Amino acid sequence: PTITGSVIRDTSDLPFASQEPERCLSDIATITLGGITDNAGGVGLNPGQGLTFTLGGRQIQAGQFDTNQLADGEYTIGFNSLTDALGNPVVSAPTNAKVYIDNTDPTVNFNRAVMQGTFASGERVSVESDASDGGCGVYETRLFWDTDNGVVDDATTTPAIGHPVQFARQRVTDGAKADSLNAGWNALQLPNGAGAVYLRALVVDRAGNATISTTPIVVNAKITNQARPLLGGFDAFKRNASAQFMSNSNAISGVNGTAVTPNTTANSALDNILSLDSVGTLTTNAYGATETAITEKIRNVGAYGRFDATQWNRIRDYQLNTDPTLRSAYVNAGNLANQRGNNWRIRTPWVELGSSDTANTQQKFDFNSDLLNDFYFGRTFGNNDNVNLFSYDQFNGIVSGTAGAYSFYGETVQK
Protein backbone atom coordinates (compact mmCIF):
# COMPACT_ATOMS: atom_id res chain seq x y z
CA PRO A 1 0.00 0.00 0.00
CA THR A 2 1.47 3.34 -1.14
CA ILE A 3 0.79 6.75 0.40
CA THR A 4 1.36 10.12 -1.24
CA GLY A 5 2.73 13.27 0.40
CA SER A 6 0.62 16.28 1.40
CA VAL A 7 1.35 19.99 0.97
CA ILE A 8 0.41 23.03 3.05
CA ARG A 9 0.99 26.47 1.55
CA ASP A 10 0.40 30.10 2.50
CA THR A 11 -2.48 31.64 0.55
CA SER A 12 -3.20 34.69 2.75
CA ASP A 13 -1.66 37.75 1.09
CA LEU A 14 -3.22 40.47 3.26
CA PRO A 15 -1.56 42.50 4.53
CA PHE A 16 1.61 41.55 2.62
CA ALA A 17 2.32 38.21 0.92
CA SER A 18 4.93 35.90 2.42
CA GLN A 19 8.38 35.62 0.84
CA GLU A 20 8.18 31.81 0.80
CA PRO A 21 4.52 30.66 0.62
CA GLU A 22 5.43 27.06 1.47
CA ARG A 23 7.96 27.55 4.30
CA CYS A 24 6.92 30.61 6.39
CA LEU A 25 3.16 30.59 7.00
CA SER A 26 0.72 33.18 8.36
CA ASP A 27 -3.03 33.35 8.90
CA ILE A 28 -5.13 31.14 6.56
CA ALA A 29 -3.34 28.40 4.56
CA THR A 30 -4.39 25.80 1.99
CA ILE A 31 -3.74 22.10 2.59
CA THR A 32 -3.89 19.40 -0.06
CA LEU A 33 -3.80 15.88 1.41
CA GLY A 34 -2.69 12.70 -0.35
CA GLY A 35 -4.14 9.24 0.13
CA ILE A 36 -3.55 5.51 0.43
CA THR A 37 -3.89 3.05 -2.46
CA ASP A 38 -3.30 -0.70 -2.61
CA ASN A 39 -0.89 -2.17 -5.16
CA ALA A 40 -2.35 -2.84 -8.62
CA GLY A 41 -3.71 -6.39 -8.93
CA GLY A 42 -3.96 -6.70 -5.12
CA VAL A 43 -7.05 -7.18 -2.96
CA GLY A 44 -7.69 -3.43 -2.97
CA LEU A 45 -7.77 -2.35 0.71
CA ASN A 46 -10.58 -2.44 3.26
CA PRO A 47 -13.59 -0.35 2.09
CA GLY A 48 -14.53 3.11 3.32
CA GLN A 49 -11.17 3.31 5.13
CA GLY A 50 -8.89 6.33 4.71
CA LEU A 51 -5.92 8.02 6.35
CA THR A 52 -6.23 10.74 8.99
CA PHE A 53 -3.75 13.62 9.01
CA THR A 54 -2.42 15.76 11.84
CA LEU A 55 -0.28 18.89 12.09
CA GLY A 56 1.53 19.21 15.43
CA GLY A 57 -1.35 18.41 17.81
CA ARG A 58 -4.36 19.23 15.61
CA GLN A 59 -6.34 16.99 13.27
CA ILE A 60 -6.28 18.60 9.82
CA GLN A 61 -8.59 18.23 6.83
CA ALA A 62 -7.91 19.24 3.22
CA GLY A 63 -8.91 22.82 2.41
CA GLN A 64 -8.58 26.11 4.32
CA PHE A 65 -6.85 25.97 7.71
CA ASP A 66 -6.34 28.82 10.17
CA THR A 67 -2.75 28.67 11.45
CA ASN A 68 -3.74 30.81 14.48
CA GLN A 69 -4.93 27.55 16.08
CA LEU A 70 -1.27 26.46 16.43
CA ALA A 71 1.71 27.95 18.25
CA ASP A 72 4.54 29.59 16.34
CA GLY A 73 7.22 27.08 15.38
CA GLU A 74 8.31 24.23 13.13
CA TYR A 75 5.81 21.54 12.10
CA THR A 76 5.31 18.72 9.59
CA ILE A 77 2.10 17.09 8.34
CA GLY A 78 1.74 13.64 9.90
CA PHE A 79 -0.37 10.58 9.06
CA ASN A 80 -1.28 7.17 10.46
CA SER A 81 -0.14 3.85 8.97
CA LEU A 82 -2.89 1.60 7.57
CA THR A 83 -2.45 -1.97 6.30
CA ASP A 84 -4.21 -3.70 3.41
CA ALA A 85 -7.05 -6.24 3.63
CA LEU A 86 -4.51 -9.08 3.96
CA GLY A 87 -2.63 -7.24 6.71
CA ASN A 88 0.44 -6.29 4.62
CA PRO A 89 2.13 -3.18 6.11
CA VAL A 90 2.75 0.08 4.28
CA VAL A 91 5.64 -0.29 1.83
CA SER A 92 6.83 3.33 1.50
CA ALA A 93 6.25 6.63 3.32
CA PRO A 94 6.81 10.18 1.98
CA THR A 95 8.82 12.69 4.01
CA ASN A 96 6.47 15.67 4.10
CA ALA A 97 7.82 19.23 3.92
CA LYS A 98 8.84 21.16 7.04
CA VAL A 99 6.91 24.41 7.62
CA TYR A 100 7.09 27.33 10.05
CA ILE A 101 4.06 29.07 11.54
CA ASP A 102 4.50 32.72 12.50
CA ASN A 103 1.46 34.86 13.36
CA THR A 104 3.36 37.57 15.28
CA ASP A 105 4.14 41.07 13.97
CA PRO A 106 7.68 42.44 14.48
CA THR A 107 8.42 44.53 17.55
CA VAL A 108 9.37 48.04 16.46
CA ASN A 109 10.42 51.14 18.39
CA PHE A 110 12.25 54.46 18.09
CA ASN A 111 15.27 55.42 20.18
CA ARG A 112 16.04 58.85 18.70
CA ALA A 113 13.44 61.64 18.52
CA VAL A 114 11.74 60.47 21.73
CA MET A 115 10.41 62.38 24.75
CA GLN A 116 10.47 65.37 22.50
CA GLY A 117 10.27 69.06 22.38
CA THR A 118 10.75 70.93 19.13
CA PHE A 119 12.77 71.15 15.95
CA ALA A 120 13.30 74.05 13.54
CA SER A 121 12.30 73.84 9.86
CA GLY A 122 15.27 73.15 7.60
CA GLU A 123 17.46 71.41 10.19
CA ARG A 124 18.26 67.74 9.81
CA VAL A 125 16.62 65.35 12.28
CA SER A 126 18.31 62.07 13.27
CA VAL A 127 15.62 59.34 13.14
CA GLU A 128 16.67 55.96 14.54
CA SER A 129 14.45 52.87 14.78
CA ASP A 130 14.88 49.22 15.80
CA ALA A 131 12.88 46.16 14.73
CA SER A 132 12.93 42.48 15.70
CA ASP A 133 10.99 39.29 14.86
CA GLY A 134 11.36 35.96 16.65
CA GLY A 135 9.65 33.92 13.91
CA CYS A 136 10.55 34.02 10.20
CA GLY A 137 12.53 37.32 10.51
CA VAL A 138 12.62 40.99 9.49
CA TYR A 139 12.36 41.71 5.74
CA GLU A 140 11.42 45.30 4.76
CA THR A 141 11.47 48.62 6.63
CA ARG A 142 10.10 52.01 5.53
CA LEU A 143 10.06 55.42 7.26
CA PHE A 144 7.42 58.10 6.78
CA TRP A 145 6.66 61.59 8.09
CA ASP A 146 3.01 62.50 8.59
CA THR A 147 1.11 65.64 9.57
CA ASP A 148 -2.29 64.14 10.42
CA ASN A 149 -3.10 61.26 12.78
CA GLY A 150 -6.21 59.12 13.31
CA VAL A 151 -7.74 59.91 9.90
CA VAL A 152 -8.80 57.36 7.27
CA ASP A 153 -10.63 59.57 4.74
CA ASP A 154 -8.43 58.97 1.69
CA ALA A 155 -8.82 60.94 -1.55
CA THR A 156 -8.19 64.19 0.35
CA THR A 157 -5.05 66.25 0.76
CA THR A 158 -4.58 69.02 3.31
CA PRO A 159 -2.33 72.06 2.63
CA ALA A 160 0.27 70.12 4.66
CA ILE A 161 -0.39 66.99 2.55
CA GLY A 162 -1.69 64.96 5.52
CA HIS A 163 -0.45 61.61 4.16
CA PRO A 164 2.61 59.65 5.27
CA VAL A 165 5.53 60.55 3.03
CA GLN A 166 8.41 58.13 2.71
CA PHE A 167 11.93 59.40 3.34
CA ALA A 168 13.90 56.22 4.13
CA ARG A 169 13.81 52.51 3.28
CA GLN A 170 15.83 49.35 3.91
CA ARG A 171 15.76 45.62 3.14
CA VAL A 172 17.34 42.67 4.96
CA THR A 173 18.58 39.90 2.68
CA ASP A 174 18.92 36.96 5.07
CA GLY A 175 15.82 37.57 7.22
CA ALA A 176 17.85 38.32 10.35
CA LYS A 177 16.12 38.34 13.72
CA ALA A 178 16.76 42.08 14.23
CA ASP A 179 17.61 45.20 12.25
CA SER A 180 18.06 48.95 12.72
CA LEU A 181 17.12 51.78 10.36
CA ASN A 182 18.92 55.10 10.86
CA ALA A 183 18.12 58.08 8.66
CA GLY A 184 17.97 61.86 8.50
CA TRP A 185 14.95 63.98 7.62
CA ASN A 186 15.03 67.66 6.64
CA ALA A 187 12.24 69.15 8.73
CA LEU A 188 9.43 70.81 6.79
CA GLN A 189 6.62 73.04 8.03
CA LEU A 190 4.03 75.53 6.81
CA PRO A 191 5.28 79.16 6.90
CA ASN A 192 5.22 80.84 10.32
CA GLY A 193 3.57 77.74 11.81
CA ALA A 194 4.13 75.41 14.76
CA GLY A 195 2.87 71.85 14.51
CA ALA A 196 3.18 68.19 15.48
CA VAL A 197 4.75 65.77 12.99
CA TYR A 198 4.60 62.00 13.46
CA LEU A 199 7.46 59.79 12.33
CA ARG A 200 6.21 56.30 11.42
CA ALA A 201 8.17 53.09 10.88
CA LEU A 202 6.50 50.29 8.88
CA VAL A 203 8.17 46.88 9.19
CA VAL A 204 7.20 43.63 7.50
CA ASP A 205 8.51 40.15 8.32
CA ARG A 206 8.75 37.20 5.87
CA ALA A 207 5.18 35.83 6.27
CA GLY A 208 3.68 39.22 5.52
CA ASN A 209 3.33 40.21 9.17
CA ALA A 210 3.33 44.03 9.30
CA THR A 211 3.66 46.55 12.12
CA ILE A 212 3.76 50.35 12.44
CA SER A 213 5.34 52.41 15.24
CA THR A 214 4.92 56.15 15.73
CA THR A 215 6.87 58.87 17.53
CA PRO A 216 5.74 62.54 17.71
CA ILE A 217 7.89 65.65 17.37
CA VAL A 218 7.17 69.36 17.11
CA VAL A 219 8.33 71.41 14.15
CA ASN A 220 8.45 75.19 14.32
CA ALA A 221 8.89 77.24 11.15
CA LYS A 222 12.16 79.17 11.03
CA ILE A 223 12.32 82.96 11.15
CA THR A 224 13.20 82.94 7.44
CA ASN A 225 10.35 80.52 6.70
CA GLN A 226 7.66 83.06 5.77
CA ALA A 227 6.20 81.91 2.42
CA ARG A 228 5.67 78.71 0.46
CA PRO A 229 7.93 78.28 -2.62
CA LEU A 230 6.42 79.49 -5.88
CA LEU A 231 5.51 76.82 -8.42
CA GLY A 232 5.46 77.06 -12.19
CA GLY A 233 3.27 75.03 -14.53
CA PHE A 234 3.39 71.26 -14.19
CA ASP A 235 1.96 68.30 -16.07
CA ALA A 236 2.06 64.51 -16.20
CA PHE A 237 2.00 63.06 -19.71
CA LYS A 238 3.06 60.03 -21.73
CA ARG A 239 6.65 60.11 -22.91
CA ASN A 240 5.78 60.16 -26.63
CA ALA A 241 3.15 62.89 -26.06
CA SER A 242 3.53 66.60 -25.21
CA ALA A 243 2.89 68.52 -21.99
CA GLN A 244 -0.15 70.66 -21.28
CA PHE A 245 0.92 72.69 -18.24
CA MET A 246 -1.47 73.92 -15.55
CA SER A 247 -1.23 76.13 -12.46
CA ASN A 248 -2.54 74.16 -9.48
CA SER A 249 0.07 74.64 -6.76
CA ASN A 250 -0.48 72.99 -3.36
CA ALA A 251 -3.17 70.77 -4.87
CA ILE A 252 -3.58 67.62 -6.92
CA SER A 253 -5.29 67.91 -10.30
CA GLY A 254 -7.54 65.40 -12.06
CA VAL A 255 -6.88 63.81 -15.43
CA ASN A 256 -6.06 66.55 -17.95
CA GLY A 257 -5.83 66.23 -21.75
CA THR A 258 -2.67 64.13 -21.32
CA ALA A 259 -3.48 60.99 -19.31
CA VAL A 260 -0.90 58.87 -17.51
CA THR A 261 -1.41 55.12 -17.09
CA PRO A 262 0.75 52.31 -15.65
CA ASN A 263 3.03 50.64 -18.17
CA THR A 264 3.47 46.88 -17.73
CA THR A 265 5.58 46.45 -20.89
CA ALA A 266 9.13 47.37 -21.93
CA ASN A 267 7.84 49.87 -24.54
CA SER A 268 9.58 53.14 -23.60
CA ALA A 269 6.93 55.15 -25.47
CA LEU A 270 4.33 54.26 -22.81
CA ASP A 271 6.35 55.60 -19.86
CA ASN A 272 5.05 58.56 -17.89
CA ILE A 273 6.81 61.90 -17.32
CA LEU A 274 6.03 64.40 -14.56
CA SER A 275 7.39 67.83 -15.48
CA LEU A 276 7.55 71.15 -13.59
CA ASP A 277 8.46 74.46 -15.23
CA SER A 278 11.66 75.97 -13.77
CA VAL A 279 10.84 79.53 -14.85
CA GLY A 280 7.99 79.97 -12.34
CA THR A 281 9.71 77.99 -9.54
CA LEU A 282 11.25 80.22 -6.88
CA THR A 283 11.64 80.67 -3.14
CA THR A 284 11.27 84.14 -1.60
CA ASN A 285 12.53 83.12 1.87
CA ALA A 286 15.69 84.98 2.94
CA TYR A 287 17.57 86.10 6.05
CA GLY A 288 19.22 94.42 1.40
CA ALA A 289 21.74 93.55 4.13
CA THR A 290 25.41 94.59 3.94
CA GLU A 291 25.78 94.74 0.15
CA THR A 292 25.03 90.98 -0.08
CA ALA A 293 21.58 89.47 0.50
CA ILE A 294 21.42 86.55 2.92
CA THR A 295 19.02 84.17 1.21
CA GLU A 296 17.46 80.71 1.17
CA LYS A 297 17.82 78.42 -1.86
CA ILE A 298 15.75 75.55 -3.21
CA ARG A 299 17.07 72.30 -1.74
CA ASN A 300 15.13 69.49 -3.41
CA VAL A 301 12.56 68.66 -6.07
CA GLY A 302 11.30 65.16 -5.31
CA ALA A 303 8.94 62.88 -7.24
CA TYR A 304 6.53 60.58 -5.43
CA GLY A 305 3.99 57.96 -6.36
CA ARG A 306 0.92 57.62 -4.17
CA PHE A 307 -0.03 54.14 -2.89
CA ASP A 308 -3.30 52.95 -4.40
CA ALA A 309 -6.26 53.94 -2.22
CA THR A 310 -8.20 50.68 -2.69
CA GLN A 311 -5.25 48.39 -1.91
CA TRP A 312 -4.29 50.51 1.09
CA ASN A 313 -7.89 50.43 2.31
CA ARG A 314 -7.89 46.63 2.05
CA ILE A 315 -4.62 46.33 3.98
CA ARG A 316 -5.81 48.78 6.64
CA ASP A 317 -9.16 47.01 7.05
CA TYR A 318 -7.36 43.69 7.43
CA GLN A 319 -4.98 45.07 10.07
CA LEU A 320 -7.84 46.76 11.98
CA ASN A 321 -10.82 44.37 11.79
CA THR A 322 -10.29 41.25 9.68
CA ASP A 323 -6.87 39.71 10.58
CA PRO A 324 -7.72 36.26 12.06
CA THR A 325 -5.05 36.82 14.76
CA LEU A 326 -7.39 39.37 16.35
CA ARG A 327 -9.94 36.63 17.06
CA SER A 328 -7.11 34.20 17.96
CA ALA A 329 -7.59 32.43 21.29
CA TYR A 330 -3.82 32.55 22.01
CA VAL A 331 -3.34 36.33 21.91
CA ASN A 332 -4.20 39.46 23.87
CA ALA A 333 -6.92 40.66 21.50
CA GLY A 334 -7.24 43.96 23.38
CA ASN A 335 -3.54 44.89 23.48
CA LEU A 336 -3.13 44.08 19.78
CA ALA A 337 -6.24 46.04 18.81
CA ASN A 338 -5.10 49.05 20.87
CA GLN A 339 -1.58 49.00 19.37
CA ARG A 340 -3.00 48.92 15.82
CA GLY A 341 -5.88 51.37 16.27
CA ASN A 342 -3.15 53.80 17.31
CA ASN A 343 -0.80 53.35 14.33
CA TRP A 344 -2.80 52.03 11.35
CA ARG A 345 -5.50 54.72 11.26
CA ILE A 346 -3.58 56.67 8.60
CA ARG A 347 -4.16 57.71 4.98
CA THR A 348 -2.55 56.09 1.94
CA PRO A 349 1.24 56.70 1.84
CA TRP A 350 3.42 58.49 -0.71
CA VAL A 351 6.30 56.46 -2.07
CA GLU A 352 9.57 58.24 -2.80
CA LEU A 353 10.36 57.63 -6.49
CA GLY A 354 13.29 60.03 -6.82
CA SER A 355 14.46 63.63 -7.25
CA SER A 356 14.05 65.84 -10.33
CA ASP A 357 16.84 68.08 -8.96
CA THR A 358 18.44 70.62 -11.30
CA ALA A 359 16.55 71.87 -14.35
CA ASN A 360 17.34 70.44 -17.78
CA THR A 361 18.12 72.21 -21.07
CA GLN A 362 14.34 72.46 -21.55
CA GLN A 363 14.01 74.42 -18.27
CA LYS A 364 12.09 71.60 -16.58
CA PHE A 365 12.32 69.41 -13.52
CA ASP A 366 11.28 66.10 -15.07
CA PHE A 367 10.89 62.55 -13.71
CA ASN A 368 10.18 59.30 -15.57
CA SER A 369 8.28 56.28 -14.24
CA ASP A 370 6.07 53.38 -15.36
CA LEU A 371 3.74 54.08 -12.39
CA LEU A 372 4.13 50.57 -10.97
CA ASN A 373 4.19 50.37 -7.16
CA ASP A 374 7.61 49.29 -5.88
CA PHE A 375 5.89 47.35 -3.09
CA TYR A 376 4.74 44.87 -5.77
CA PHE A 377 5.69 43.33 -9.15
CA GLY A 378 8.65 41.53 -7.60
CA ARG A 379 10.40 44.68 -6.37
CA THR A 380 9.42 44.02 -2.74
CA PHE A 381 6.62 41.45 -2.92
CA GLY A 382 5.58 39.32 -5.90
CA ASN A 383 2.19 40.64 -7.01
CA ASN A 384 1.43 40.77 -10.74
CA ASP A 385 -2.30 40.46 -11.43
CA ASN A 386 -4.81 43.32 -11.25
CA VAL A 387 -2.56 46.21 -12.27
CA ASN A 388 -5.18 48.68 -10.99
CA LEU A 389 -4.62 47.59 -7.38
CA PHE A 390 -0.82 47.44 -7.58
CA SER A 391 -0.06 50.71 -9.37
CA TYR A 392 0.17 54.30 -8.14
CA ASP A 393 -3.05 56.32 -8.35
CA GLN A 394 -1.28 59.72 -8.22
CA PHE A 395 1.96 61.08 -9.66
CA ASN A 396 3.12 63.88 -7.34
CA GLY A 397 6.08 66.11 -6.49
CA ILE A 398 7.40 68.20 -3.59
CA VAL A 399 9.56 71.32 -3.85
CA SER A 400 11.44 72.09 -0.64
CA GLY A 401 13.82 74.95 0.16
CA THR A 402 16.70 75.38 2.58
CA ALA A 403 14.46 77.33 5.00
CA GLY A 404 12.20 74.25 5.32
CA ALA A 405 9.22 75.66 3.38
CA TYR A 406 7.63 73.36 0.80
CA SER A 407 4.94 73.12 -1.87
CA PHE A 408 3.42 70.11 -3.62
CA TYR A 409 1.86 69.36 -6.99
CA GLY A 410 0.68 66.36 -8.98
CA GLU A 411 -1.94 64.63 -11.10
CA THR A 412 -4.23 61.63 -10.62
CA VAL A 413 -3.31 58.51 -12.58
CA GLN A 414 -5.84 57.49 -15.25
CA LYS A 415 -5.02 53.81 -14.61
Partner: protein, 119 residues
Protein backbone atom coordinates in the same frame (compact mmCIF):
# COMPACT_ATOMS: atom_id res chain seq x y z
CA UNK B 1 37.78 52.66 -0.73
CA UNK B 2 40.97 52.33 -2.76
CA UNK B 3 41.47 54.13 -6.06
CA UNK B 4 41.24 52.07 -9.24
CA UNK B 5 43.49 52.58 -12.28
CA UNK B 6 40.48 54.12 -14.07
CA UNK B 7 40.41 57.13 -11.70
CA UNK B 8 37.37 56.46 -9.48
CA UNK B 9 36.90 54.66 -6.17
CA UNK B 10 36.05 50.96 -6.18
CA UNK B 11 32.41 49.93 -5.92
CA UNK B 12 31.26 49.02 -2.40
CA UNK B 13 28.19 49.52 -0.19
CA UNK B 14 30.30 50.38 2.89
CA UNK B 15 33.74 51.93 3.19
CA UNK B 16 35.95 54.83 4.19
CA UNK B 17 38.54 57.16 2.67
CA UNK B 18 40.74 59.97 3.93
CA UNK B 19 39.93 63.15 1.99
CA UNK B 20 41.44 66.65 1.95
CA UNK B 21 39.17 69.64 1.16
CA UNK B 22 39.52 73.43 0.84
CA UNK B 23 36.93 76.26 0.77
CA UNK B 24 37.45 79.91 -0.25
CA UNK B 25 36.05 82.75 -2.42
CA UNK B 26 35.16 85.13 -0.95
CA UNK B 27 36.63 84.02 2.38
CA UNK B 28 40.28 83.19 2.86
CA UNK B 29 41.03 79.50 2.12
CA UNK B 30 40.42 77.02 4.92
CA UNK B 31 40.84 73.28 4.55
CA UNK B 32 40.39 70.00 6.40
CA UNK B 33 41.65 66.44 6.03
CA UNK B 34 39.18 63.97 7.51
CA UNK B 35 38.13 60.32 7.33
CA UNK B 36 34.89 60.17 5.36
CA UNK B 37 32.76 57.06 5.95
CA UNK B 38 29.72 55.53 4.26
CA UNK B 39 27.62 52.53 5.27
CA UNK B 40 28.74 50.32 8.15
CA UNK B 41 32.45 50.54 8.89
CA UNK B 42 34.58 48.39 11.18
CA UNK B 43 37.17 49.89 13.53
CA UNK B 44 39.87 48.55 15.86
CA UNK B 45 41.09 49.92 19.22
CA UNK B 46 44.34 48.96 20.93
CA UNK B 47 44.68 48.65 24.71
CA UNK B 48 46.82 46.86 27.31
CA UNK B 49 45.92 43.24 28.03
CA UNK B 50 43.21 42.81 30.67
CA UNK B 51 41.97 46.42 30.44
CA UNK B 52 38.25 47.21 30.37
CA UNK B 53 37.45 48.95 27.09
CA UNK B 54 34.33 50.97 26.31
CA UNK B 55 33.46 52.70 23.03
CA UNK B 56 30.79 55.36 22.69
CA UNK B 57 29.30 57.43 19.91
CA UNK B 58 29.53 61.18 20.57
CA UNK B 59 29.05 61.38 24.36
CA UNK B 60 30.01 59.28 27.37
CA UNK B 61 27.54 61.30 29.46
CA UNK B 62 26.00 64.74 29.67
CA UNK B 63 22.91 65.06 27.49
CA UNK B 64 22.49 68.56 26.05
CA UNK B 65 18.75 69.20 26.42
CA UNK B 66 18.65 72.69 24.75
CA UNK B 67 20.25 71.40 21.53
CA UNK B 68 18.08 68.18 21.60
CA UNK B 69 21.30 66.15 21.84
CA UNK B 70 21.16 63.10 24.10
CA UNK B 71 23.34 60.23 25.26
CA UNK B 72 21.53 56.88 25.39
CA UNK B 73 22.27 53.32 26.48
CA UNK B 74 22.17 52.27 22.80
CA UNK B 75 25.11 54.59 21.98
CA UNK B 76 27.61 52.11 23.43
CA UNK B 77 29.31 50.58 20.39
CA UNK B 78 31.35 48.07 22.39
CA UNK B 79 32.29 47.21 25.98
CA UNK B 80 34.44 44.35 27.24
CA UNK B 81 35.49 43.75 30.84
CA UNK B 82 38.79 42.18 29.75
CA UNK B 83 40.74 42.59 26.50
CA UNK B 84 43.47 40.45 24.93
CA UNK B 85 45.28 43.51 23.52
CA UNK B 86 42.88 44.76 20.83
CA UNK B 87 39.16 45.15 20.24
CA UNK B 88 37.02 45.42 17.12
CA UNK B 89 33.71 47.26 16.82
CA UNK B 90 31.31 48.46 14.13
CA UNK B 91 29.74 51.85 13.39
CA UNK B 92 26.73 52.68 11.23
CA UNK B 93 27.46 56.01 9.52
CA UNK B 94 23.72 56.74 9.28
CA UNK B 95 23.55 57.16 13.08
CA UNK B 96 23.23 60.82 14.15
CA UNK B 97 22.25 61.90 10.64
CA UNK B 98 22.04 65.53 11.85
CA UNK B 99 25.85 65.67 11.52
CA UNK B 100 26.08 64.71 7.84
CA UNK B 101 29.02 66.66 6.42
CA UNK B 102 30.47 67.75 9.78
CA UNK B 103 32.67 66.02 12.32
CA UNK B 104 31.29 63.54 14.84
CA UNK B 105 33.54 61.84 17.37
CA UNK B 106 34.00 58.30 18.63
CA UNK B 107 34.97 58.19 22.30
CA UNK B 108 37.14 55.44 23.78
CA UNK B 109 37.43 54.89 27.55
CA UNK B 110 40.06 52.63 29.13
CA UNK B 111 39.78 51.48 32.77
CA UNK B 112 37.08 54.14 33.30
CA UNK B 113 39.78 56.86 33.36
CA UNK B 114 41.66 57.27 30.06
CA UNK B 115 39.57 58.97 27.35
CA UNK B 116 40.48 59.41 23.66
CA UNK B 117 38.57 60.77 20.68
CA UNK B 118 38.51 60.10 16.94
CA UNK B 119 36.52 62.25 14.44
Amino acid sequence: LTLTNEGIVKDADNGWRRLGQGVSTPSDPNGNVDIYVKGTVNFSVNAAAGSKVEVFLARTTGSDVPTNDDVQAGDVLRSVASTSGTETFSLDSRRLAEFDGVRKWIVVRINGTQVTYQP
